[PDB]
Symmetry: C3
Subunit: 147 residues, 3 copies
Amino acid sequence: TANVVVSNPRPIFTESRSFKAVANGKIYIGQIDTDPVNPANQIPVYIENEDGSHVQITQPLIINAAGKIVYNGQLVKIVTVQGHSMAIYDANGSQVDYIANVLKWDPDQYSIEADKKFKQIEDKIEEILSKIYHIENEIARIKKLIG
Amino acid sequence: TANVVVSNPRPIFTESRSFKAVANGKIYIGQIDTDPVNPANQIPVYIENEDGSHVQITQPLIINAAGKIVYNGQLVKIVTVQGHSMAIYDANGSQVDYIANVLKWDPDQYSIEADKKFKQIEDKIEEILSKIYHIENEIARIKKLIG
Amino acid sequence: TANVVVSNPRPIFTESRSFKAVANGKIYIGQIDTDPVNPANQIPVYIENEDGSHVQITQPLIINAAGKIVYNGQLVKIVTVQGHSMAIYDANGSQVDYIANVLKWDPDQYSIEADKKFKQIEDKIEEILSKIYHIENEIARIKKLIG
């Protein structure tokens, strides 16, 4: 069937040397392959509201005691451009993680499978166009004979 | 290469105000943008067995001390329709989370890239069809001349 | 917009009977639907370096006190073929999990949507080819009349 796994989409952020939340930690979000702590490298981040509206907020993003992103005391869904770097720091200012391009961590790879398939159809379209131009040329020849 | 990240696909469910599992918590699964606690809004959920078979089970789903979904004392893979709402409650009956449409939390976005590409091929197909109809009309004209 | 959720891509590995990291645990990676503890079933695993280079390493993969994969004392990104089995064991040698095919746990399903769309374009291409062959046959007939 088309059935798919039940999952838990809201991310949690945990430390790298012990099993603990990054409580009162900070997340920076930047251009791919840059240092997002530098404001010059930061990109727009937005709360995506329940109704679908978007509100831009400042960086860093704040991680609560549960390891979840919060704004004004509430859980929030933060969105940005698929391709971005991310740096995570704990309340001590120690770096927990750095990801140069979050898009390069996809375990699901149905993008590239599709790109092959698109390239294949384009090849059939080229051959079809070649047949058409040949037919056009046959017609031109006929017209000349009879005219 | 086509190599992709090693990941941990089985979800865990943790609390929202402290870093703890939702031990003996409950998960409800419903139509997109509805309250899944209401039985009228619930949709079928299934254990997907090791052999690929599916067994429908009742709601709520049960979360163990580890924060993993269990049935009859064993870890299970639960499946449902990609588009669904989810509500998670702790053993105290407090709401941990509500997700209106789990599909809208995809960080991987290779669906929409493909939809542009499909629309583009369809455009080439339209132009090809226009050439063909023009050729048909030229042939009709020739037939009339010679007939 | 094309905006997508901020997430936490680096996996963490936690126990199945209590809420704890699989500290000093082991991960085996194998062919789909096999027992990856058996070396005969294991497949190549690689560190994907910051610069994009790949270095093959031995199995098992090692899980640190934080539940993250490490090599030579540092966090690492491990890659392999999308389709693989995975088995996870704790420091006691107890099995934490077994996943027959990690690819079958995708909650995002934009592969199969695309495969329908590809099949549909291929159908238009068949009909287009039929029109073309019919036109070719009309031209052959004309040539015979006039020749």
